[PDB]
Ligand binder design. Structure first.
Ligand SMILES: COc1c(N2C[C@@H]3CCCN[C@@H]3C2)c(F)cc2c(=O)c(C(=O)O)cn(C3CC3)c12
Ligand SMILES: COc1c(N2C[C@@H]3CCCN[C@@H]3C2)c(F)cc2c(=O)c(C(=O)O)cn(C3CC3)c12
Ligand SMILES: [Mg+2]
Ligand SMILES: [Mg+2]
Ligand SMILES: [Mg+2]
Ligand SMILES: [Mg+2]
Lengths: 245, 487, 487, 247
DNA sequence: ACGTGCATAGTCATTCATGA
DNA sequence: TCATGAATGACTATGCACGT
């Protein structure tokens, strides 16, 4: 068991449960999203750490500069473990580390910067499956009489719309289907009922299979060699749609 | 270089600031209970179509529209004013429908302008009801490009409902919010008893307005302070939150605070208790835990020691925290461009007067527009009775001006009427269409007679205020939140 | 809970970011030379009516309109983008007419959004010319509420004119600005010699585009770098400011810098000289004084020591400061949704292709609308020829549909024609108005004949591009600013 | 008497002049970062310095002295003027013989002027007594004639006067662009500020004079003091007659 | 000394590629 | 290491009156 703040980052909205095994850290993109997340959370088991701005690339940046970064210190401190050789999983303050970013591309980019931080400084957190990715909603279907439904894809949107109409429900063509363009646009209630309620949230657990293959990919994508990255993007962007086919 | 004495400069400059702040910034107009920034936001959103019958527009568009046409000040503080009008813990009756993160009763600040969307609420639509029928005076904006309203129709007593607080120069206001249904009763009485003197009116209105009704619920302790505010325009109203004592399986007792008095920051409240214990001055408390959530609302659990009495600890909280705190009422509002401290019967009366003004002006506007149309229709009917001639006359005219001048001479009609005949489509020459014009004339002359009747009878005018207000209250009126108890 | 491999996540996420940044953020479309934010700001201003024929609107209204409908990002950085497009030292041909403080070539930041006003410039109106005539493909915005243009008509070669600089992923662009009159000559040649191969075209275009033309004037030293940039898509162009040696009364030779190379901060430049002097890297300098003002422009006076040669000190300034600095050209633009490094002949050719597309599409749109209007007029002329019958038929009709159906039977007309007749006003039955209808039909059939001729002859299509662009250059074209010298 | 100007121990926001002679130097105390920015650009950098003040100035009448000296904006003024305050005041060390207060024409500009004039009268009175303090009068209107040079107006009256004369003279204005109305210094560019408030050959300055020192002491205490009641009765008593102070 | 609400925005740190 | 330019806003201090 570990003490919660009521010696940690100022932006950390810690949980109440003193058991790491039962605790969860939501690393959130933006002060706005983090603010509403702080309100909709379960304050017992869920803590919020809002990260502001693009995270520093630890692959590119010198080590001393990374340690001066206010946002990295927030993560390293709030996780408690330590980094590199001084890493100690025993001091992990949250056994669930959920990265929650916007569905847009800059959200995707921030996650790749965080996954890089974790893989390089605190790799065992990934290997032992403590790192997760929350999937935010893309749409909110606001039925005229029925309860609202949330969708996490264009496909699911079309599916819930079709089913509902077939079931005799109806929607306004003005208000209609609210489309989320980021977590910042969501209020406390919406975030709970889509990303933080453990009975309905869609989490993805980051797994690490081939460590050597991962090591090279991180260096190619996040490294200082532009040439290697430029040829990689031109080589593989052509086939991103077919990675899971 | 001209010389100026420091006394002349200081006096002129500071008085100009104080007067503008007093009349045109910090204090509410008595008729609609709005400050200039409030009124200008709402009209901007209204004119922009940001209404409840359409989806929320990005709130940035409301700020920018306000800035560009009406409110020559900063986007930052204007956004703050808009956000406030959308918070259910600030306004007893929110005027803005916010979408997104608009903050909390604690220290959680609202999301930035870019993240949030907003539109007018249905009640705010009653603030602006029939503003387009010359129901209120308009003046040119800050650069004469466009017109802005001096006051809103305000078809529900907004000043008393949502209250107002403002710091001006030499003075400040602090009007608490009230329950709409209770205010409506006061207005209904004021309409029926329109001849009653101030002495009788104050007695009646105080009987119906039982006291302020805060959006944050809570308790009002005592009746003296409330009575003072209504008879004096000043009064200290003691508020309390609600505390429920819970017992534990072991046996230990804990206090649960689920409501706090109006305008008490939840985070500052919890911190104050912690800091007093940590200072060691609220003994008997064993632990402070905020079990609040979006789903249970406010829930501050104060576990107390076994050698501690629940009420002793509660009384200490009343004494040393804002669990019990007073509302300094000061009924200050601008009346006819002048700041005035008002009695409760004055606040109602002035509002009722405003409603009657609004409806007489609306009636006047409709009567004028009815007469204009009735006069254009009369011209068309003349044309139909001589339709054979009318057409042949236009056909046999070189220009349209020659056709027009001919129409006046033939049918003995105005140039406005003759124009309407010319502007008439070949559609309306159909049999059933000729008949619509006839019936419409008959339809309007009945409406003109009705409208003339309303203006001639103060009884009907008062009835319209009553009947229209009753509709609003039946729609948007809600239960009381703040419970009133005695000492 | 679903499992995901870190390699799969990293690759998909980073590629998606890289591709969006590349195609939809950092790099310009080759046809109009605009990035998404530019295109959306300008269209927002255009659609809001913020045009040169109306007074400057508050810039907040442009940001909000862009943000609310087209550009789902922060108000802050969008304002920066709008501001930049209004600065004469940034854009060679500003697209925004700024009113107020928009900063300076030094460290003076622009005024906040609240203090500034803005509208489109006449040249920006040429970017958007006839966009409402289906000249470019439109797609739904970020939430499908409204349509936005994929590219602007861009009736002057904006990419080459105003240039572009952008940092993407895996690549970056840096296209210098050019003199409009020189670009037009290149375009005129490309139109005349439309069959010319790339080898000939590149030779011709390079002869007319003598080199970059920076808004900050200055000098271009050498011709190799310019030649490389146009043949390779990459080249290092050596720039210089202008230095004039003045001699004093007491005898105090001093260097006066009145121009600096493109994108050199005035304040950072002075600071660099000042810091490299007290350090011991620029001996011979005695004193640095900034005699710049709004009325004389840039004027940095560098007094040199008496035992110092002016030319020695100037070469030292060339070496150790940005008084001489290179422009790293990298002609990268998005071509058909794909990033491409282009030769100068490709940049011109691709633009000419776009202009021809715009005019063929404009002609097709006008021909369609002409046929529709012609059709309706043909119906009206039939009605006038049988005007006696038309009227008597509508009078004796129960409904308008019965009158309509009758008109079809009488004149053998479409339902669109009969409706147009029905909607006709008695206005138009006057003699001159009946004749106006006749002549209008004749006018269109002449215009239809013209339009059909345009579509059938590529010669005329090219002619329209030339003639219309020529008009634009004669009005908005200006002298060269950057002087080109040899080694 | 000459003093060094900053060029790559004075306030950071200060944009100092080049002239080392105080007798020829001028300090423009400006309201707002935007306006101060434009002033820095439109000025004559030889004789004119700019000090932008941000936000409403602290009331030295109400606040304790220790709090006033901790205020970043007051420290900037006291430092830039160089003299010192109260008993340690030394006019000999005055770095500018012209201290121009430039605020918006709006009501909030007037308020800032009273807060600055209070600071000067209480901390550095001799600057007022010796006529070193001035008030710049910003323009209210810019008349943009179609063919002729644009004219600036400093009142509703002058606007009406210049408009009539020009129209009578055969000039013309657009009814769209037309007459630009300034709502603050922040809306002006560098050129406009030069041609109305900073160019010494056309600027409209007012020199602050001090006649009755005892009466001034009382007015300052009434308007700016901690006594609200005294201020409330004074405003209600005299606001009714502000229009008629110069009739 | 703190809260209140309408008024009077610059500063601060990263991604990303390239050349000094 | 710094500039470039679109991307990912909270904090900082005064006026003003009033009550604990
Ligand atoms: C620089 O002025 C402001 C400060 N400053 C006051 C002090 C001055 C020196 C720097 N430190 C503080 C910061 C502040 F803290 C907040 C705001 C503010 O919120 C605001 C708005 O439109 O909402 C507008 N302004 C500006 C119009 C002046 C604010
Ligand atoms: C808080 O993030 C920002 C910083 N901060 C990032 C760092 C975090 C810790 C504190 N220090 C830095 C400051 C900054 F300096 C500038 C901007 C900024 O300009 C901006 C915009 O709309 O233009 C938007 N944002 C936010 C959307 C992220 C900025
Ligand atoms: Mg986002
Ligand atoms: Mg503010
Ligand atoms: Mg920014
Ligand atoms: Mg102002």
């Amino acid at each position: 068991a570990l003490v919660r703040r009521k010696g940690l980052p100022g932006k950390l909205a810690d949980c109440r449960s003193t058991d790491p095994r039962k605790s969860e850290l939501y690393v959130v993109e933006g002060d706005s999203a983090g603010g509403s997340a702080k309100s909709g959370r379960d304050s017992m088991f869920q803590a919020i750490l809002p990260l502001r701005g693009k995270i520093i690339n630890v692959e590119k940046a010198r080590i001393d500069r990374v340690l001066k970064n206010t946002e990295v210190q927030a993560i390293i401190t709030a996780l408690g473990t330590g980094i590199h050789d001084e890493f100690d999983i025993g001091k992990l303050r949250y056994h669930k580390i959920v990265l929650m970013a916007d569905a847009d591309v800059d959200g995707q980019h921030i996650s790749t910067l965080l996954l890089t931080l974790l893989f390089r400084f605190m790799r065992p957190l990934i290997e032992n499956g403590h790192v997760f990715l929350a999937q935010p909603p893309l749409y909110k279907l606001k039925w005229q009489r029925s309860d609202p439904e949330f969708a996490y894809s264009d496909r699911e949107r079309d599916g819930l719309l079709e089913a509902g109409l077939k079931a005799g429900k109806k929607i306004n063509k003005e208000d209609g289907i609210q489309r989320y363009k980021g977590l910042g646009e969501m209020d406390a209630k919406e975030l709970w009922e889509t990303t933080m309620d453990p009975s309905v949230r869609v989490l993805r657990q980051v797994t690490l299979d081939d460590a050597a293959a991962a090591d090279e990919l991180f260096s190619i994508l996040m490294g200082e060699d532009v040439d290697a990255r430029r040829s990689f993007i031109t080589r593989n962007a052509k086939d991103v749609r077919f990675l899971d086919v | 270089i001209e010389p100026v004495d420091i006394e002349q400069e200081m006096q002129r400059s500071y008085i100009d600031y104080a007067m503008s702040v007093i009349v045109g910034r910090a204090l509410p107009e008595v008729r609609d209970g709005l400050k200039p920034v409030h009124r200008r936001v709402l009209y901007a959103m209204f004119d922009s179509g940001f209404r409840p019958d359409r989806s929320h527009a990005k709130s940035a568009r409301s700020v920018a529209e306000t800035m560009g046409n009406y409110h020559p000040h900063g986007d930052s503080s204007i956004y703050d004013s808009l956000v406030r009008m959308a918070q259910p813990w600030s306004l007893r009756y929110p005027l803005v429908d916010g979408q997104g993160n608009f903050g909390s009763p604690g220290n959680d600040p609202p999301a930035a302008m870019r993240y949030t969307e907003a539109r007018l609420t249905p009640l705010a639509m009653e603030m602006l009801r029939e503003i387009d029928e010359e129901t209120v005076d308009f003046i040119p904006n800050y650069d004469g490009r466009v017109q802005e309203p001096t006051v809103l129709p305000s078809r529900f007593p907004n000043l008393l409902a949502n209250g107002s607080g403002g710091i001006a120069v030499g003075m400040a206001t602090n009007i608490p919010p009230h329950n709409l249904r209770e205010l409506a009763d006061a207005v209904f009485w004021a309409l029926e008893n329109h001849d009653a003197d101030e002495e009788e009116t104050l007695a009646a209105v105080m009987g119906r307005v039982k006291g302020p009704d805060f959006p944050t619920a809570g308790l009002i302790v005592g009746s003296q302070g409330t009575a003072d505010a209504y008879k004096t325009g000043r009064g200290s109203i003691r508020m309390r939150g609600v505390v429920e004592v819970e017992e534990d399986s072991r046996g230990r007792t804990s206090l649960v605070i689920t409501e706090l008095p109006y305008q008490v920051n939840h985070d500052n409240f919890i911190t104050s208790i912690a800091e007093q214990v940590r200072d060691g001055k609220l003994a008997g408390i064993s632990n402070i835990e905020d079990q609040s959530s979006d789903r249970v609302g406010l829930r501050i659990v104060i576990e107390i020691k076994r050698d501690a009495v629940a009420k002793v600890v509660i009384n200490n909280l009343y004494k040393h925290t804002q669990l019990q705190t007073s509302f300094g009422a000061n009924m200050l509002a601008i009346v006819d461009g002048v700041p005035r401290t008002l009695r409760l019967d004055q606040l109602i009366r002035y509002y009722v007067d405003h409603q009657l003004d609004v409806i007489v002006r609306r009636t006047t506007y409709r009567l004028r527009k009815a007469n204009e149309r009735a006069h254009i229709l009369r011209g068309l009917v003349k044309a139909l009775d001589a339709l054979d001639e009318v057409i042949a006359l236009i056909r046999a005219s070189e220009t349209v001006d020659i056709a027009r001048a001919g129409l006046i001479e033939l049918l003995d009609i105005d140039e406005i009427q003759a124009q309407a005949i010319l502007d008439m489509q070949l559609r309306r020459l159909a049999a059933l269409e000729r008949q619509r014009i006839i019936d419409d004339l008959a339809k309007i002359e009945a409406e003109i007679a009705d409208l003339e009747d309303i203006l001639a009878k103060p009884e009907r005018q008062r009835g319209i205020v009553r009947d229209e207000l009753a509709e609003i209250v039946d729609r948007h009126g809600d239960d009381r939140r703040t419970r009133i108890i005695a000492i």
